[PDB]
Amino acid sequence: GSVTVDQRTNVLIVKDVRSNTERARSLVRSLDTQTPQV
C-alpha cells in the first residue's frame, strides 16, 4: 500500500506512507537522472 498514478502531462503521483513515497521518489529521480545526460 501505496500507489502510483500516471497523469497525462508525464508526471507521476504517489500516495503512501512517507517511507514508500521516499523510495518511489529516489527511484523515479535516479532513473530520470540518467535521462538528463543527453
Partner: protein, 158 residues
C-alpha cells in the same frame, strides 16, 4: 470403493509440472541471456582493433565497422546490440523470452591494458572517459540471477 491410482498419478504429474515449472523457467531465461552474451561478443574484435589502431573507443557500430544499424545485430531473444563508445550492450527482445528479462540488457566493455585491452561482462554500463565506465542504473538491467558466473563484472572491475 476403488479408483484412486489413476486420480493420484494424474495429480502427481500435474504437481510435478508445477515444480518443474520454475526450474525450466530460469534454466530457460538463463539460456536466453547466454546468447545475448554471444551476440555481444564477437564484436569485441571490431572494438578492440578500433581502439588499438586509433587509441580512441569506437563511438558507434559504424565506427567499429559493424552493422551500422543496432537492430541489424539482433537475434531470437536479442532485439539488438549497440556499440556506444567501445561499450557493447545487448538488448533482450520482447517476444520469445522469459518474462522478467525481456527488454532487459547487459554490457561488455574493455579497459586499456596499454598495448592491449581486457574485456569485462556484466550489467549495463556507460562510458565516462576512455578508461572509466559506470552503472547505466535505470532499471532495465538483466537480473544477476540470469547472468553467467563469467558475466558478474562490476563497473569498476579491473
Amino acid at each position: 470403493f476403488t479408483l484412486i491410482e489413476l486420480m493420484i498419478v494424474i495429480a502427481i504429474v500435474g504437481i510435478l509440472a508445477a515444480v518443474a515449472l520454475p526450474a525450466y523457467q530460469d534454466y530457460t531465461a538463463r539460456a536466453q541471456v547466454s546468447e545475448a552474451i554471444l551476440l555481444a561478443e564477437g564484436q569485441k574484435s571490431a572494438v578492440t582493433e578500433y581502439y588499438l589502431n586509433h587509441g580512441k573507443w569506437p563511438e558507434n557500430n559504424t565506427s567499429a565497422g559493424v552493422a551500422s544499424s543496432p537492430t541489424d545485430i539482433k537475434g531470437k531473444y536479442v532485439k539488438e546490440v549497440e556499440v556506444k563508445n567501445g561499450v557493447v550492450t545487448a538488448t533482450m527482445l520482447s517476444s520469445g523470452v522469459n518474462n522478467e528479462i525481456k527488454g532487459k540488457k547487459l554490457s561488455l566493455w574493455a579497459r586499456r591494458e596499454n598495448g592491449s585491452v581486457k574485456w569485462f561482462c556484466g550489467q549495463p554500463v556507460t562510458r565516462t572517459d576512455d578508461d572509466t565506465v559506470a552503472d547505466a542504473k535505470d532499471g532495465k538491467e538483466i537480473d544477476t540471477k540470469h547472468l553467467p558466473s563469467t558475466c558478474r563484472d562490476n563497473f569498476d572491475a579491473k
